[PDB]
């Protein structure tokens, strides 16, 4: 009845965000279900790229805007627990990257991207209404078909119709020190192409480690580390079938 899309959501607690620059709040017992309302397609009349929960107020509020926008104020409201969507802040490509929402408007050859709203110079840009939830914003280049080549956009330059934005994979700036447990990184990519399980939640696979009982070993979001010093990083899986799997990280030097 619910999906732990928090495996996708980004967590920062004891904080709050306000944008007093002229908002929907729904009562749920769990941030997971509030995220589920946000995840549910058509369910949310506004496109929430964030939301905060507090267990204490029994209320959840959802923002159609992340901290990345201007006009947002960051404060220490300890009861409030933020929830971002790392997909926007990714600035990385995951395979086909069908769900790429990042704000890159430049192509490999350096000619501006055409807005998806303007039919000049390319009239195959009728997609802003064709595919709801494409997040296809004003100009930034996405992958509305989830086509394999990568996020492509139409160029203002009349000659070339579409060119694929080159966008570096998250792995390229990620290395692993031979132990890996010292490495405190940003990846969430196993070898089998699955996303980790949430540490703080214990569902569905039930694991022994909780971040509160082992703080400063960074069991945050779903970040493949070495909790016990394995050669290369690892986590429990969301997948009901596989208990746990490593994560493949390249090595750095110098």
């Amino acid at each position: 009845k619910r999906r732990n899309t928090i495996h996708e959501f980004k967590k920062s607690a004891k904080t709050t965000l306000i944008k007093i620059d002229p908002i929907k709040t729904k009562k749920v017992n769990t941030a997971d279900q509030c995220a589920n309302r946000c995840t549910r397609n058509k369910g949310l009349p506004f496109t929430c790229k964030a939301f905060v929960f507090d267990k204490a107020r029994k209320q959840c509020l959802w923002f159609p805007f992340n901290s990345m926008s201007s006009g947002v104020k960051k404060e220490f409201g300890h009861e409030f627990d933020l929830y971002e969507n790392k997909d926007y802040i990714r600035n990385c490509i995951i395979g086909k990257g069908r769900s790429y929402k990042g704000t890159v408007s430049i192509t490999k050859s350096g000619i501006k991207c055409q807005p998806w709203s303007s039919m000049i110079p390319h009239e195959h840009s009728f997609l802003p209404s064709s595919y709801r939830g494409k997040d296809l914003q004003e100009n930034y280049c996405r992958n509305p078909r989830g086509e394999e080549g990568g996020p492509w956009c139409f160029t203002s330059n009349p000659e070339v119709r579409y060119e694929v934005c080159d966008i570096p994979q998250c792995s390229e700036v990620e290395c692993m020190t031979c132990n890996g447990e010292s490495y405190r990184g940003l990846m969430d990519h196993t070898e089998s192409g699955k996303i980790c399980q949430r540490w703080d939640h214990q569902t569905p696979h039930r694991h022994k480690f909780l971040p509160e009982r082992y703080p400063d070993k960074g069991f945050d979001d779903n970040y493949c580390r070495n909790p016990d010093g394995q050669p290369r990083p690892w986590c429990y899986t969301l997948d009901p079938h596989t208990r746990w799997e490593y994560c493949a990280i390249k090595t750095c030097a110098d």
Binding site: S118, M119, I120, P121, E123, H124, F126, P158, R161
Partner: protein, 688 residues
Amino acid sequence: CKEALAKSEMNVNMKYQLPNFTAETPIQNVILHEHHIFLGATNYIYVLNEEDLQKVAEYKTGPVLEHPDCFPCQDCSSKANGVWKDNINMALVVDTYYDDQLISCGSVNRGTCQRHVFPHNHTADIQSEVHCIFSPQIEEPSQCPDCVVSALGAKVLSSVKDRFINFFVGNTINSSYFPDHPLHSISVRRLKETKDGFMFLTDQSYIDVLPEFRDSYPIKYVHAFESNNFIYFLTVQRETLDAQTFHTRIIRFCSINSGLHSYMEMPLECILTKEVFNILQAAYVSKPGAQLARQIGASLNDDILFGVFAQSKPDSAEPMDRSAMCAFPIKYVNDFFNKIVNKNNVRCLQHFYGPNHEHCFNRTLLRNSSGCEARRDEYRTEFTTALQRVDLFMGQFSEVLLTSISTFIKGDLTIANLGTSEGRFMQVVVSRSGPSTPHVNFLLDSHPVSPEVIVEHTLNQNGYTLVITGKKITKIPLNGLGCRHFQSCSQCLSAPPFVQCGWCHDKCVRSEECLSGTWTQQICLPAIYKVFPNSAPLEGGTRLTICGWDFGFRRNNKFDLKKTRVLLGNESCTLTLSESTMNTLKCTVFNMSIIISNGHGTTQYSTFSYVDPVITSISPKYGPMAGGTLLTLTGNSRHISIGGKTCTLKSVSNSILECYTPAQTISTEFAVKLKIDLANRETSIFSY
């Protein structure tokens, strides 16, 4: 059985009685004016009333002796020495600025024009007053201000600037024609107010292809129109004279009679998706309907250019009979000329300025900072980055050549009066949103449709479209020529609402005729044609093809093949998606009625049975083992085999099956088991 149920597809060829007028010779141009409709035709001028197309008055432009020394409009009938050539009208315009006159523009007679005058009481009587435009140019006899129109091909557009009737004329020029008598590729003519000649206001007023490129680089003009204080032209010229591959081009220049100061060519192409069509067959300028407005992003009031782009034989101008139609919101084209292409894309203009010249070497383009300010050093320009468009039909016409197009609006939809090369006249509710099937697709005439079409829409509910095919002029009411031709319910519901008719249980029909009161236009029952097969064993869940139509839920354009289910008795037969079409079903499950449920209605078909197989008798009984003898069986999609080897089936029937026994290296008898997808009751033994 897709072929058999093709009767669902509309009857493409049905015959219509519409006001049809015929001429003795081919018709080239036609003009509508004050409840008369004039036609120019080979050697003749015809004026006809609209609603009947009765040839009320006929004025004959006689074939005319062409003799080298006989002057154009002096009378040389007395000459006995030199050929009885004929004339074909290429420019017929109406002027009413000065007085209600018609102007005709002949081919043979050196291309000199003449004007007919309408008397006040009676307008059809054109033959009464005819005056030939002609002025002996005493000052500079070397040039023709009055030798207007060429022979090979021309377009002529009349306008009233500054209290001034200006003819913007384009000509096709063969190298041979010039030294005898000069002409010009594009030119601007003032009519002398005393209506007895034309004047070239300045050597600038014209542009002629340089003397060397006459025989090569021929440009033929295909359309000419005015908008927004600009006079565009549409032509087809090779991108490079050496390359010799013709491509579509557009011409822009403000309407200043002094001459063509802001002269800009741009390449225009329409692609499909990257297949590019380099040829344009016809064009029509119109305003768009509400639906298309957003869909191409244009405001409801802006002008729009519709062009039927066609693929052309490679390295040649001949169309390949693969076509498209594409829409060019005029605001987009004007923006493209002024700022979308930068100086690097621009060049000098080859055919006039020359391959190498001081102008070609270097010049600033006051392209953005100035619009049309008359410059004594006017610059001829040729862009290189074609304005790319995409198809409006997504290539549904990829195989059939289009030759003539027109467009009107209706409600919020916008309609196209397409015409093909073999004389079929479609009408399509055009939208990028959905592939929409023509609601009129009758065959008009054997000859190709002419691009010259006159369309008048009156009070927005009564209109018509004169179209010209070969020697035939026909009046088509745009209001929906009919809907009798529809026979498939989905088609009945897909026909745009402006034609009021809907399904009543057997055929698409106008509302007020069929009495049953079942006449509906929103929801209708699916129809089954046949079922194969209807003999099923108890255990056999066997492949049943179902032939019918309207098997898909009817929504705007998309068909929801998902709101479908099949009920057999009480159980539901196993419906498989990839082989279920609004055309046919392919399902796999004591006469029983099959029921088919759809998102709209449920249909009952009684042609099904759960037949219990019977086998009783076998031939032979005792014989040899050679494995070549025939076997005869009898009883009540199958297969038969013995000893792991399948006998070849000599014959098939419900009540008589013949098989050639397989060869077995054994001398005893075997009970033979039928395998009708399943091992049903075996027969007895036969002595090998």
